[PDB]
């Protein structure tokens, strides 16, 4: 079990840790989050009580170093930082635990929700999508635009998701225009899986990361990326059976987790109707189709 200590909480803020969230009052004696499961990436996220604009947060993996949060009164945000002195860090965490100033990561034993949302998500892959190589953790917020969004402005603060465009030379082989546009198997299997991602694990990792950025920060570009990666699989007539089975599970947990009240802005009606009812894979996503139909029958 790992710990993310906080120097202090000078401003009133909703703090998220993965799918959990806690209200902290201005100058409340809060010194961080303990009992964080090792073996998973995590995201610690923030919405200021005084400006519900700019949800922001840090993707991190506690195996890659000792991380803490400290409010920066100049930049006006909770910043993640690395403590290189292991003994200074253990000493700080031990003190705060002894004084019970920390919230416990409130995992239910039965509950595989966070594993199911992050199964393929790797910190090394997050750091290639979010470039800031001097830190081992990754900052994301509501407003960050994708490399693709910037093509259609500051490249330093961009989400470097894999560009997917169904009406691109990359997606369409000369002389297979109709075939490649109506059945995207070539684009999925040769260009994206064999060519760019190398395997379905990295593809699902980016898909899962895109969803979580859409859900936790309302990052619009991430939502576009999550939908594009779903639609590329559903629009392919030839998909490995293991990828289809795994996609059904991935999407099931994403739909299960989505706040009911955010379905209207995080779910694209056209893509879901197409994927569940028109696409080649319309009969391959049983779990996902059952939860969508019972939870969001209005969208369909």
């Amino acid at each position: 079990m790992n710990t993310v200590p906080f120097t202090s909480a000078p401003i009133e803020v909703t703090i998220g840790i993965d799918q959990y969230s806690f209200n902290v009052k201005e100058n409340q004696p809060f010194h961080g989050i303990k009992d964080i499961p090792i073996g998973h990436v995590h995201v610690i996220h923030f919405q200021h009580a005084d400006n519900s604009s700019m949800r922001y947060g840090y993707w991190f993996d506690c195996r890659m170093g000792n991380f803490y949060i400290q409010y920066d009164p100049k930049d006006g945000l909770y910043k993640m930082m690395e403590e290189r002195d292991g003994a200074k860090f253990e000493n700080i965490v031990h003190n705060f635990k002894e004084r019970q100033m920390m919230v416990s990561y409130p995992k239910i034993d039965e509950d595989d929700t966070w594993y199911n949302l992050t199964e393929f998500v790797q910190m090394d892959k997050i750091r290639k999508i979010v470039r800031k190589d001097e830190n081992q953790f990754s900052y994301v917020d509501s407003s960050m635009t994708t490399v693709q969004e910037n093509e259609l402005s500051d490249p330093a603060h961009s989400l470097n998701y894999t560009v997917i465009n169904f009406k691109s030379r990359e997606a369409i082989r000369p002389g297979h225009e109709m075939e490649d546009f109506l059945d995207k198997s070539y684009y999925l299997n040769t260009v994206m899986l064999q060519g760019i991602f190398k395997n379905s694990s990295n593809y699902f990792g980016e898909l899962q990361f895109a969803f979580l950025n859409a859900m936790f920060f309302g990052n619009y570009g991430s939502s576009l990326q999550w939908h594009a990666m779903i639609e590329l699989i559903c629009s392919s007539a030839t998909v490995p059976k293991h990828m289809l089975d795994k996609l059904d599970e991935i999407l099931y947990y994403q739909i299960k987790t989505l706040p009911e009240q955010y379905s209207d802005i995080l779910l694209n009606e056209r893509v879901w109707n197409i994927c569940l009812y028109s696409s080649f894979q319309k009969n391959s996503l049983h779990n996902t189709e059952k939860i969508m139909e019972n939870k969001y029958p209005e969208l369909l």
Binding site: K167, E177, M178
Partner: protein
């Protein structure tokens, strides 16, 4: 975006553009089989690709052999249309290539955009206009060359004959759309109006009769009357 009544004059500027109409590409007769089921027999079709400024018509004849052993023909027809327009653009010298292609039907946008990915600077556009280019097969000489084709063939016409010697491309296009609208609404009546007076003939190198300016005004009046009558019939108004 879309071509409408508001941006009509753009058709007659000096930016090269083509209209593409796919409505006569896939044509069938529906008939009964011996077992009393229904079957289609394909007949020769054509892509109607028209420069509205010059009157140059690139009539790509679609021979029935292109459908042999193919499924989902109404869908393939859109993609075959897009392939043939793309091949026509690539065959033209750079300075003759269109800056814009306007499709008369929205179902052509994605097929043509995908075939023209090599031409990112050519704008593919829909139109709000209800253009009567479906009636192209009511022009006897175009109908004749399509039905006689025994293989795929491109035939070049000027759909305005020699009109641009006397009128602007705006007025030539208005005359053409009124003739095609008439032919589409009541073909027999339209063709009767055009050919009733045997003294006015069609030159061998033309599609339409050799009317004087005065006889065109009368013809155009008879076509407008034909169209309003048929409208009052259609709609009991």
């Amino acid at each position: 975006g879309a071509m409408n009544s508001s941006n009509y004059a753009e058709l007659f500027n000096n930016d090269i553009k083509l209209f593409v109409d796919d409505t006569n590409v896939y044509r069938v007769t529906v008939h009964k089989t011996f077992e009393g089921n229904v079957a289609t027999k394909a007949i020769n079709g054509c892509i109607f690709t028209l420069n509205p400024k010059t009157g140059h018509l690139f009539l790509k004849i679609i021979h029935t052999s292109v459908w042999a052993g193919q499924k989902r023909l109404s869908q393939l027809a859109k993609w075959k249309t897009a392939e043939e327009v793309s091949a026509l653009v690539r065959s033209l010298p750079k300075e003759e290539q269109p800056k814009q292609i306007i499709v008369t039907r929205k179902a052509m946008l994605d097929p043509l955009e995908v075939h023209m990915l090599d031409f990112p600077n050519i704008a593919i556009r829909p139109t709000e206009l209800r253009l009567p280019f479906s009636a192209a097969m009511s022009i006897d000489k175009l109908s004749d060359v399509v039905m006689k084709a025994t293989e795929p063939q491109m035939v070049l016409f000027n759909i305005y004959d020699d009109w641009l010697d006397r009128i602007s491309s705006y007025t030539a296009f208005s005359r053409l759309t009124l003739l095609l609208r008439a032919l589409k609404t009541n073909e027999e009546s339209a063709k009767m109006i055009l050919l009733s007076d045997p003294t006015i003939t069609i030159k061998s190198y033309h599609l339409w009769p050799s009317f004087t300016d005065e006889q065109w005004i009368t013809i155009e009046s008879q076509m407008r009357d034909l169209i309003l009558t048929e409208y009052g019939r259609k709609y009991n108004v």
